[PDB]
Amino acid sequence: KNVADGLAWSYYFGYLKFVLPELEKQIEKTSKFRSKEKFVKKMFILIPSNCFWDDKIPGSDYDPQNRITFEGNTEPLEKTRGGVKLRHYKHSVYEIKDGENEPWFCIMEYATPLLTLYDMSVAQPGELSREERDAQVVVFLRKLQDILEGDRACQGKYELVTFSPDRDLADVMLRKLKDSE
Amino acid sequence: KNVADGLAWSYYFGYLKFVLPELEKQIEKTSKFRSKEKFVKKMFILIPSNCFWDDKIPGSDYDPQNRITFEGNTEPLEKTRGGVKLRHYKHSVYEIKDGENEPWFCIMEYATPLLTLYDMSVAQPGELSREERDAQVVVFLRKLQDILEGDRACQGKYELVTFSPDRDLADVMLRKLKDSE
Ligand SMILES: Nc1nc2c(ncn2[C@@H]2O[C@@H]3COP(=O)(O)O[C@H]4[C@@H](O)[C@H](n5cnc6c(=O)[nH]c(N)nc65)O[C@@H]4COP(=O)(O)O[C@H]3[C@H]2O)c(=O)[nH]1
Ligand SMILES: Nc1nc2c(ncn2[C@@H]2O[C@@H]3COP(=O)(O)O[C@H]4[C@@H](O)[C@H](n5cnc6c(=O)[nH]c(N)nc65)O[C@@H]4COP(=O)(O)O[C@H]3[C@H]2O)c(=O)[nH]1
Numbered sequence: 001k002n003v004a005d006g007l008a009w010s011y012y013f014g015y016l017k018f019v020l021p022e023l024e025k026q027i028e029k030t031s032k033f034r035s036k037e038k039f040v041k042k043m044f045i046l047i048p049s050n051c052f053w054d055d056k057i058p059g060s061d062y063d064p065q066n067r068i069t070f071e072g073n074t075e076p077l078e079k080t081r082g083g084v085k086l087r088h089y090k091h092s093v094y095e096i097k098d099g100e101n102e103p104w105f106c107i108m109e110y111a112t113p114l115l116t117l118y119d120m121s122v123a124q125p126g127e128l129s130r131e132e133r134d135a136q137v138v139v140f141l142r143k144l145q146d147i148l149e150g151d152r153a154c155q156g157k158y159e160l161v162t163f164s165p166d167r168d169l170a171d172v173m174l175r176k177l178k179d180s181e
Numbered sequence: 182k183n184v185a186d187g188l189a190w191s192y193y194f195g196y197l198k199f200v201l202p203e204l205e206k207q208i209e210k211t212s213k214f215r216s217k218e219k220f221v222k223k224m225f226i227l228i229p230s231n232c233f234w235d236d237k238i239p240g241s242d243y244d245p246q247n248r249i250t251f252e253g254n255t256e257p258l259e260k261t262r263g264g265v266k267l268r269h270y271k272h273s274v275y276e277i278k279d280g281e282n283e284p285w286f287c288i289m290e291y292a293t294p295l296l297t298l299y300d301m302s303v304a305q306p307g308e309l310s311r312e313e314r315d316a317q318v319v320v321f322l323r324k325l326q327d328i329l330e331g332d333r334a335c336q337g338k339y340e341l342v343t344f345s346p347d348r349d350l351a352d353v354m355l356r357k358l359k360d361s362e
């Protein structure tokens with residue numbers, strides 16, 4: 001009985017399933033983004049092991065060297081779920097310094113369902129202990145992997161990024177951007 | 182291992198936990214709503230047994246006699262989750278005919294996590310059969326009841342409304358509005 005399973009299926013069907021196949025095309029709608037080299041087009045989904053964040057990524061405790069900068073948003077994608085509610089999905093583009101080289105552009109986002117794990121652990125510790133929360137993060141990670149890997153339209157469109165609150169996200173992102181296709 | 186459990190906890194922590202305690206007060210910000218009698222202030226959360234809806238409630242297959250009318254929206258509530266994302270929550274007010282009497286106003290909303298159950302059953306039948314979906318609706322209902330009933334701030338602020346696709350929502354709502362305190 002894993003609360004993370006529902007969190008992963010809902011993250012997919014209520015969001016990723018339709019934003020991931022279109023992400024590259026949405027990005028391509030902006031001339032600046034068409035012109036930019038070193039712009040990896042995958043959604044980097046951030047999964048901090050403590051299920052927590054409280055600020056903008058640039059200059060945050062995860063960016064101690066201040067190497068991450070908000071660049072702008074992608075062109076909104078429209079989607080209608082249920083038949084009644086029109087929703088607009090857009091993503092934040094960040095610039096990540098690469099020493100004296102050309103800086104990278106990338107798409108980064110926290111996995112928002114992790115806030116529920118965090119909220120649960122604080123408001124209902126009897127339901128989710130700290131150690132049970134740690135474990136549900138892993139369950140969440142593995143299930144989301146299975147779901148996304150089972151969808152051919154999502155192949156190559158994302159990368160899950162797990163890290164400890166002590167890690168430097170700029171360092172983590174630089175390695176993942178360099179290793180991207 | 183019930184996918185519905187995760188769906189219910191996130192529906193709560195990502196939405197209901199903060200909209201339900203404030204709903205009556207948000208409604209009271211509009212003079213028309215302060216002036217209106219027979220305006221039950223609870224959120225009526227709609228849980229169709231088939232996990233499905235494809236249109237506006239007024240005049241829908243659930244409103245065969247056309248007794249439900251969209252009246253307007255509540256004043257948005259602002260909330261910041263994560264520290265980074267400002268969100269605006271608002272709700273639809275509907276008028277429901279009561280014969281020759283003064284019509285009711287009420288707040289009605291489909292439980293959006295049910296779409297994930299629906300989407301799963303159609304896209305991944307191997308993961309969720311039709312009969313398994315039926316069962317997850319019941320699990321979802323009972324878990325959401327436990328969660329909401331455990332939060333004193335949500336007491337008296339909602340009502341879960343379960344119905345078959347053959348039911349007349351206007352009749353169902355009328356009985357529940359008359360039975361409200
Ligand atoms: N980083 C981040 N960004 C998010 C998130 N959710 C929405 N956004 C984005 O923020 C924009 C405005 O959010 P809003 O102020 O709450 O204002 C929203 C909200 O009041 C409402 N809304 C949002 N989700 C739902 C839903 O599931 N059902 C219904 N009935 N209304 C919704 O419609 C308004 C506009 O919707 P959108 O066009 O899609 O535009 C959304 C959407 O592009 C999130 O969880 N994380
Ligand atoms: N970055 C980003 N992620 C998105 C966006 N839309 C959906 N997601 C992700 O998909 C998850 C589940 O979306 P949901 O099925 O609509 O299921 C939601 C929905 O049923 C309900 N909910 C949340 N916000 C609203 C709202 O504004 N209006 C209504 N009617 N329901 C809402 O709470 C459920 C869980 O909410 P979450 O914890 O936020 O979890 C969200 C969120 O993690 C988005 O625009 N931007």
